[PDB]
Amino acid sequence: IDGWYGFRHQNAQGEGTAADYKSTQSAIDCITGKLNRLIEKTNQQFELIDN
Amino acid sequence: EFTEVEKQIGNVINWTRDSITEVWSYNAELLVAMENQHTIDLADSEMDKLYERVKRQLRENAEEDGTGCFEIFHKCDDDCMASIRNNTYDHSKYREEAMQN
Amino acid sequence: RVKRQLRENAEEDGTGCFEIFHKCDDDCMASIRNNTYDHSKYREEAMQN
Amino acid sequence: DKICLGHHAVSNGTKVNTLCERGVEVVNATETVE
Numbered sequence: 542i543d544g545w546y547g548f549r550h551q552n553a554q555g556e557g558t559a560a561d562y563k564s565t566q567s568a569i570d571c572i573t574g575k576l577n578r579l580i581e582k583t584n585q586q587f588e589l590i591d592n
Numbered sequence: 593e594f595t596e597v598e599k600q601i602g603n604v605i606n607w608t609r610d611s612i613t614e615v616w617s618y619n620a621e622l623l624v625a626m627e628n629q630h631t632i633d634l635a636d637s638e639m640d641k642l643y644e645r646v647k648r649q650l651r652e653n654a655e656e657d658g659t660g661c662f663e664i665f666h667k668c669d670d671d672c673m674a675s676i677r678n679n680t681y682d683h684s685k686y687r688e689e690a691m692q693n
Numbered sequence: 694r695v696k697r698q699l700r701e702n703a704e705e706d707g708t709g710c711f712e713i714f715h716k717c718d719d720d721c722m723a724s725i726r727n728n729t730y731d732h733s734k735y736r737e738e739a740m741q742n
Numbered sequence: 743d744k745i746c747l748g749h750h751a752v753s754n755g756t757k758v759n760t761l762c763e764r765g766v767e768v769v770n771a772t773e774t775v776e
């Protein structure tokens with residue numbers, strides 16, 4: 542739940558379900574940049590042609 | 593441009609030209625973004641190709657560290673650089689002297 | 694990146710999990726987690742195994 | 743006794759768009775809009 546990409550620490554002492562930061566931060570940055578690029582309204586106002 | 597056309601057909605022409613302008617502008621933006629991404633991926637792929645080709649040429653004699661530099665165990669001189677550069681190097685000649693490191 | 698960090702200390706089994714030969718504690722977990730691990734401290738112990 | 747790898751780069755580049763970011767710094771950029 543902390544990050545997308547995590548680690549399974551098997552030290553024969555416990556179970557460390559850690560999470561990375563760099564790669565998942567790059568992935569979230571790229572995906573939110575993709576949505577900032579695409580999810581946008583039009584910049585041209587149209588007109589009603591038919592009736 | 594000089595003498596104005598009938599208003600209804602002029603509005604139809606402007607609406608069609610504006611829709612075509614929107615389609616071509618979106619197509620140009622998607623085209624530029626797609627081929628810039630493909631050019632960046634192509635550069636990364638060619639760098640990865642060169643890195644793995646040098647790794648296959650160097651074999652076990654040089655161990656990668658995680659930087660792009662190769663720690664060649666043999667005393668690999670300038671002619672050895674030329675051999676690993678222009679696809680001439682053989683690992684079987686130098687494995688005996690580079691195996692103990 | 695983890696493969697480049699673990700020079701000879703660990704190898705890929707085939708299922709994608711590294712098998713560290715030497716003793717790699719929770720500080721070594723943290724060192725490979727935040728990329729501060731070094732091969733200069735455990736080349737020889739992992740090489741002898 | 744080692745050999746390193748790398749690629750050419752420039753001090754000042756041009757910011758271009760891409761599929762997942764805006765204003766990515768690259769080496770060279772041509773103009774597609776006259």
Ligand SMILES: *[C@@H]1O[C@H](CO)[C@@H](O)[C@H](O)[C@H]1NC(C)=O
Nearest residue numbers: 597598599600601602603606
């Ligand atoms: C169509 O658009 C042009 C501008 O591109 C404008 O000058 C012209 O008046 C428009 N036509 C009509 C019928 O309004």
Ligand SMILES: *[C@@H]1O[C@H](CO)[C@@H](O)[C@H](O)[C@H]1NC(C)=O
Nearest residue numbers: 751752769770771772773774
């Ligand atoms: C970059 O592209 C331009 C074309 O716009 C070209 O004239 C130039 O030689 C290229 N290289 C550099 C280093 O500017």
